[PDB]
């Protein structure tokens, strides 16, 4: 009996009764160092253990999972390198910031021009959050990575109006955008549980940097770079920075990201959006 | 045990008018009703049984009707010899239960 | 044909029962699967992640919900003052509802295992001090002073050295499992009371802020288990979803 | 044969509470349910809720469930309802009428 | 202390209500004896909040069809329930040609007949279902008129349900249908935080901005219980 | 002369009536078509006096649900019967959300359908059930207001039953339900003397002090028969 | 599919029948069991314990029920006077209803085996005497005098030496089993009559009490068996339990 | 097939048919010297055979049955010793006396102060009943041990009133309490069948003492000492003491009990009740 | 929640003519109808209940009838004391709902 | 479950047909038999007298 | 006879489901087949023209 069920890809076998020829009609069954350099780039971020998201390094597409007949392009050096985006400024009234990937890099560098000439897209990313403060400051940040981060609206506040987020909200670019309701993350989901996703705490009395290695997470081997945004990047201060008068009032935050193992397919004419 | 309540308790009416008295059961018997007439210091007498059919020796002025639980008894037209208390009975389940009684006076 | 007699339970539909039904589309084959990172084969892997516990929950914080994730720590005139106290039962209305463990303990009635509550100091680098963190077995109220809170299982934790502490709530129970405790008759499952006490004081130099905020974090250990799956109290549908 | 006497008209500023009283006689008080009915302008009527005066049994209208309570004293015969957070459109004449034996149906006589 | 209860198999093996199809005699929406229903799991809250725990999910479904009159009574009436795959003809009446079921699967069931179960495989063209899709499936300039297209995954539209009273004439009885789903042979990926806010719409996670509810229950002081 | 009949397995393998749930159209208690029932075995005398022979007991149960109108007639009406574990939502009406059964087990059965049986395991958090619990499950000072808490074992509260007529509208038929229990896979400990006095309440063994009945039957003289 | 024809007995619910039903909660596991003392795997272990038999049951003892557990023994003017007599059928209304064997023989119709009736002397240490304890096979009435009670199976038992005696009622029956005897037609199962006679006298010295009380005790032997499980006559529910 | 049934802990196997994956849904199936010294204490109680309740000596908690992670305390010498409680006096109108365990010892000795500082509790007990009378007296006592002995009320005597026993009745202490209805044991259960539980007869012409070794009987390995009372101790005279005038009119009864193998867990602050 | 609508809203008729007022329910109750008469500044009074049976103290000029959903009330012959508003009630499901009312004036 | 179709002869009671019914009293055992003279295992032994 | 309980999906007709039905004409035999050119065992052979 050939297996047409939905569990056939797993390596775990179950004991299941079936009275028919199709296996999906069966029952449920009982269960049994370093100096990081992308190509030519360097950061200082210390030290030793950094967070690999879901315990997988970014790699290429295996031949079993790729249905594309064409041979993909792999511009190793020109694509994969540290890209420093626009700097933010922390304020006592600040709320948060969210970036969409790979939205920010579509307009920047060779990586941006290849995503325009090519239809499909695959890459891993490397996120580096950068914040600096003296030993007299205090505060905490939460840097998270949320696969498939939707943006919900307030429905006008009465709840009876149907409202959708505009294009500028869902496609921020390298300038990011600010959250108007950090507690629900503007998704209707709590901030307290945000740490279920890969996260790193930036605490001003311990570490000034954060690094998250994000693999490629999608239901399909290749995806479109312009239409579909994979995962968001949330920097939300949990504890407000507090400093006595006379210290430095402007504390910037810098986001430097790099792609890892980027494959492009389906060469075509230039398409902006 | 099924209980029955009659309304009203005391109905005062003169001679020549129609009188409608009711009997209500807690459960639906469908088959069983008996209306009685007891004069003062006399034994009861059966008038209409099975909620419709009138008994022997009963004048044709008495027409009972009903179905299900709620039942009724209509008297047209009232005469001078018909004053007295009225009762209602169930045949359906033991014990056989009787109503509280309805006194019929002259207005 | 074969003689057969039907038994009670015929023509009943049990939602939870595992049956075998007829295929709608013969000869079908699924889309071949690929490798997607982060596969979850059991929910206990999720209950072991460390999520923010809300120790500060008040009626004045409902207008600004972000104040609910941290509770303040300041220099004190008197020594030994109580800072925070809350119950340790995860499936009970209170601080534990913001934890992913708390929302996944609503789908299950009985729970048994040792929990963990981690604290994180967000203050400055020049801030020094030590605070006592205790756990009181059931049967008492909130300890009146620190001399009664030492008699439990406590840990002494320093700000200037370690920026995080892991308190392991042991499993102390008169039963192998435990149901969700609440007011009235079911309170016999009460887990305990977790308190935080100033031991010395919070000492700050000239120029550093005199206030500090601690973030609470909670998770589960390896032996934490659950059973008797159940509906949840939190989600409420009063009207049709349009 | 059956008399139901209520309280007198009452005036109150918005935001406060009010408690009425309904006293009856002529029948066994524990064997008959009681209901409350409000009449707004002009002819509009609504159904507040019923009560069964043995120990307690209560049924509220889903709209008025939060704005009204029902209590019954079984020693001295009375029926009292209390209203919380009054407003402008809550001013109406209120009725109390007896129900059916062991039943909320069989509309009030 | 066995972990079997906490497995994702036993957690999704419960059966729950996806949708309610109503087909009355008198009314507005369906008076003609046929009802078309687009496939959505987001209609009801309890089953939705389980599926939104995760991001990507791969599973096979088993549906159960409970037919009764809206008051609970049952009468001997014959019914047909067919599955219309995406792009097939949708019947415009109960006498139309789409009911000849020369291809599309159909079911012949009575009201007194015990409920009907069918096993539905995983037909999505992708490797797994995704309830959260960030992007615009179209191309070109994105205006405010097509903004409704946000969060619409073309891979998640699996067809349209259809049901009719079997016959040329009209039946006097009004029927209502409650469809259930039992998730089996399930795989999961990338867990997400659960939703503490009340649901509003089916297609997008909108929350009422004035109704924001604190997850935890408030108390007086943090030094007391 | 085999002892198999005297074994505790065959002695508890009989089936008996635990409770009677009534759901009429007209009346006082349940007029709305839904009935919630807290789980208690103490309601009826015969099955209770067997379980009170022992102290601690560990067993699995099999319930049978007999639905009929109070006069014995049967009509084609659809019914739902679900099990609410401790701490779940209890439905306040028949249209509420608690009936979506996304987790809680439920049953779909008709009146003409043969009775429904379900196997219930041993879910008590302790190692065995105890019908006799000496103590106060609370703490602190014990006054006369909370004195009702005596003999209340928190381990013995297993949930609440729930049943409704399936539909949005109300059904004209009044239903009554008789639930039965068959104790199987039973273990026993610490036998006790049987109760010679009539039962009074469910939760505590109160006996009427003026009604005290001599166990044996009296006779005239001990030298005669 | 498989051709099948239904047979009578379809759609019937037999309370005693052992079937197989559907599980309500898949993947469930019980609370792991522990060792609890005093496990009873069979009811005959309970029927063999020794419980107080009530020989003295009168219409004047109903106001003071404690007088019912003992019957008096006093010095007699005439020798050979009868003290106590009662029937030996355990499942019959009478003395045997206070025995745990009697209440467990109500749940079973037929019973076969040898019983035992033990007596205990609660009098003083200076009390001396011997009494005859006899068992009469069925067919006779209570023996008029002692000369007719010797012809059965009797035992002679002394107060001043042994404080307890075990009388073994043999199994004498025309049938392998025996049902519960009662008045009228079913009395053909009558077991017998157990009598107690003064043989010598009850002798007391100066200063010791002239009265004494004997407590009766009854149990079953190893070969006692029961069958045909049944409802019981004793328990009565006339009204709903509130 | 893993066994989820309720009989899995037993060592006896049955033949049972199952059509499903869960074993609890299967059918019922066919069935197949001395000088006693606690630490420093001595009694005189004679002789030879004494009653072990249910044929088990008090022992510690096995590692398989204990779910408590903490290490329990075992104060061998200070805890386990003979404790002499208050003496009673037998009268011709007397009825009976009942003690609750471990109620009597919560206020006495080191055993009392450890039960207050500790949450859980486990111990075995040793009960010694003491009565003395001359050879001219007569009488009989019945000393029984009833696990989980509930106290029922008279319901006002009409039966329609719901009444519960007060705290002083259900928590007597070392002074015990008297039974107002010995025939029903104030539980609604007969006295004639009381001997089903472990018992010893004290007969004044034979033995002056009684000893019952009681193990720890509960559904849980550890229990709370303050809230939950395990078993009662009933001394009910079946035969009234009768003595001629001039003898000793006061016959006392003394109860000396000792714990055996006491384990304490869950150290906390002092809790009285 | 079942709603009921009465027609007409205001019916003006002189003395001596028959008047038929109607009450319609969204769902089919079959068992339950109550017609009320509320004079000006007075408490309501029950006239006919159970859609057919007239209550106590009600004159025989009022005959109600109906089945299923649609119900009716017929008044023959109208007198001078019968003017006032009329209402209709359902016993069937909570909440108990009332009609909008029908004013009866003199032509 | 197992697919099955019923055939004519369902729900009929044939008096002579040999079926299998459900036991009323589980765990029961008969009174042990003894030797009674004159056992008749077939009726033709009677027809030969 | 054999104890059996019915499950949901009884008495339903699924058009696509593959069952087993009863033969109308016992002892029947088909007309013996011959070789006809151009046999199509799969539709993808047609889609490639
Ligand atoms: C004849 C019976 C009809 C068979 C219909 C089978 C199609 C439905 C199979 C299950 C559908 C997947 C679960 C639903 C998930 C969400 O609603 C989709 N993402 C909708 O966008
Ligand atoms: C869907 C069917 C409902 C399933 C309900 C199963 C829960 C009941 C299982 C048996 C309950 C144990 C027997 C009852 C004993 C006593 O009543 C309890 N000690 C109550 O205190």
Residue numbers in the entry:
A (entry chain B), H (entry chain B): 14 to 45, 83 to 323
B (entry chain E), I (entry chain E): 1 to 107
C (entry chain C), G (entry chain C): 1 to 242
D (entry chain F): 1 to 109
E (entry chain A), F (entry chain A): 73 to 297
J (entry chain C), K (entry chain C): 1 to 49
Please share text taken word for word from the publication where this structure appeared:
Coxsackievirus A16 (CVA16), a member of the Enterovirus genus within the Picornaviridae family, is one of the major causative agents of hand, foot and mouth disease (HFMD) prevalent in infants and young children. Like other enteroviruses (EVs), CVA16 is a nonenveloped virus of ~30 nm in diameter with a single-stranded, positive-sense RNA genome of ~7.4 kb in length packaged in a protein shell termed capsid. Specifically, CVA16 utilizes cell surface heparan sulfate (HS) glycosaminoglycans as its attachment receptor, and human scavenger receptor B2 (SCARB2, also known as lysosomal integral membrane protein 2, LIMP-2) as its uncoating receptor. Cryo-EM studies show that 9B5 and 8C4 target distinct epitopes located at the 5-fold and 3-fold protrusions of CVA16 capsids, respectively, and exhibit differential binding preference to three forms of naturally occurring CVA16 particles.
From the same CVA16–9B5 dataset, we obtained three cryo-EM maps in distinct conformations namely C1, C2, and C3, at the resolution of 2.90, 3.35, and 3.80 Å and population distribution of 29.3%, 37.2%, and 33.5%, respectively. Here, our structures showed that the radii of the viral capsid of C1 and C2 are 161.4 Å and 162.3 Å, respectively, similar to that of the native CVA16 mature virion but smaller than that of C3 (169.2 Å). Additionally, the VP1 hydrophobic pocket in C1 and C2 capsids is filled with a pocket factor, which functions to stabilize viral particles, but the VP1 pocket is empty and collapsed in the C3 capsid. These features indicate that the C1 and C2 viral particles are in the native/compact state, while that in C3 is in the expanded state. Moreover, the central sections of the CVA16–9B5 maps revealed that the density corresponding to viral RNA genome is present inside the C1 capsid shell but absent in C2 and C3 capsids. Taken together, these data suggested: (1) the viral particle in C1 is in the native/compact state, similar to that of mature CVA16 virion; (2) the viral particle in C2 resembles the compact empty particle/procapsid; (3) the viral particle in C3 probably adopts the expanded empty particle configuration. The C2 is most similar to the compact empty particle (RMSD 1.16 Å), while C3 is similar to the expanded empty particle (RMSD 1.24 Å). In all of the CVA16–9B5 maps, 9B5 Fab binds to the five-fold vertex, with each CVA16 protomer bound with a Fab. Specifically, 9B5 is able to bind all three particle forms, whereas 8C4 recognizes only the compact particles (including mature virion and compact empty particle) but not the expanded empty particle.
